[PDB]
Swiss-Prot record, chain A:
It comes from Homo sapiens (Human). Linked to PRKN in a head-to-head arrangement on opposite DNA strands and share a common 5'-flanking promoter region. Keywords: Cell projection, Cilium, Cytoplasm, Cytoskeleton, Flagellum. GO terms for molecular function: actin binding; alpha-tubulin binding; beta-tubulin binding; G protein-coupled receptor binding; heat shock protein binding; Hsp70 protein binding; Hsp90 protein binding; protein-folding chaperone binding. GO terms for biological process: cellular response to unfolded protein; flagellated sperm motility; protein localization; spermatid development. It comes from the Eukaryota. Expressed in all immune tissues, spleen, lymph nodes, thymus, tonsils, leukocyte and bone marrow. Expressed also in heart, brain, skeletal muscle, kidney, lung and pancreas. Expressed in primary Schwann cells and very weakly by monocyte-derived macrophages the primary host cells of Mycobacterium leprae, the causative agent of leprosy. Component of Lewy bodies, intraneuronal inclusions found in the brain of Parkinson disease patients. This is Parkin coregulated gene protein. The lineage of its organism: Eukaryota, Metazoa, Chordata, Craniata, Vertebrata. The chain holds residues 70 to 294 of 296 of the full protein. One of its GO terms (cellular component) is cell body. Microtubule inner protein component of sperm flagellar doublet microtubules. Forms a large molecular chaperone complex containing heat shock proteins 70 and 90 and chaperonin components. Interacts with STIP1, PRKN, GPR37, HSPA8, TCP1/CCT1, CCT2, CCT3, CCT4, CCT5, CCT6A, CCT7 and CCT8. Interacts with MEIG1. The keyword Coiled coil does not apply. It is found in: Cytoplasm, Cytoskeleton, Cilium axoneme; Cytoplasm, Cytoskeleton, Flagellum axoneme. Microtubule inner protein (MIP) part of the dynein-decorated doublet microtubules (DMTs) in cilia axoneme, which is required for motile cilia beating. Suppresses cell death induced by accumulation of unfolded Pael receptor (Pael-R, a substrate of Parkin). Facilitates the formation of inclusions consisting of Pael-R, molecular chaperones, protein degradation molecules and itself when proteasome is inhibited. May play an important role in the formation of Lewy bodies and protection of dopaminergic neurons against Parkinson disease.
From Swiss-Prot, chain B:
It comes from Homo sapiens (Human). GO terms for cellular component: cytosol; manchette; nucleus. Keywords: Differentiation, Spermatogenesis. InterPro entries: Meiosis-expressed_gene_1. Belongs to the MEIG1 family. The lineage of its organism: Eukaryota, Metazoa, Chordata, Craniata, Vertebrata. GO terms for biological process: manchette assembly; protein localization; sperm axoneme assembly. Essential for spermiogenesis. PANTHER family: MEIOSIS EXPRESSED GENE 1 PROTEIN HOMOLOG, MEIOSIS-EXPRESSED GENE 1 PROTEIN. It comes from the Eukaryota. This is Meiosis expressed gene 1 protein homolog. The keyword Repeat does not apply. It holds the Pfam family Meiosis_expr.
Amino acid sequence: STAFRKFYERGDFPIALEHDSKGNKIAWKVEIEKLDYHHYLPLFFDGLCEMTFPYEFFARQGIHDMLEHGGNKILPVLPQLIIPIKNALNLRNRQVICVTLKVLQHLVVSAEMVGKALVPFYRQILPVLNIFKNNIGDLIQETLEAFERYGGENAFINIKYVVPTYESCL
Amino acid sequence: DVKPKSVSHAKKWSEEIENLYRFQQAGYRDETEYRQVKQVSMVDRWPETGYVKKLQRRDNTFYYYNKQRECDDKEVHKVKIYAY
Ligand SMILES: [Cl-]
């Protein structure tokens, strides 16, 4: 939030602060594949909290492109994303939760093994969903099923421990 | 746990290799293992080059690194590239 806003105004923000009239794409000043994700990916995840235009547009578009094109750069940075994900979800804001769950869905298919490496952090990130469980209720279910699907053998029970009402058939 | 899947050796110096050389000199595979072993806010880096400036070793002594390239072509091939 405040950290993302400082980031946004710096020269080393890797996205060009321009709008092209043809479309809504973002233009990268620096090639994604040359960014050290250890530095840049946590900063973009810092902006999950952001709801103010134009910061939130660039936070969201930035996260998406970095997940889409991260390849093998994403998993090594997973440990540094837990605290930003947790801080965003724990605001208890429905709009932030909705965008964060869609981001998490993208994260677990972003690269191989990311879903499984997420399992030990379930207890840090899933609790607030119990406030919002069964629109957000359907999104929570769809997101938990994504986690289970790419989380390997130990996923279901660990989801169920934190989300006791969780049932699924996949 | 988040640990690399595979390891190869490098044969051409690069910005990536320089920073890997600095972590490995200090006893760490890469930044991921450094951040697992120690509690880190941000790694100290040189502004102009982005190179690792300072690292704390396992016995809690510190290594310092030059603003400019330290990895010799003759030492490049000793730097391990880890895959995840
Ligand atoms: Cl996304």
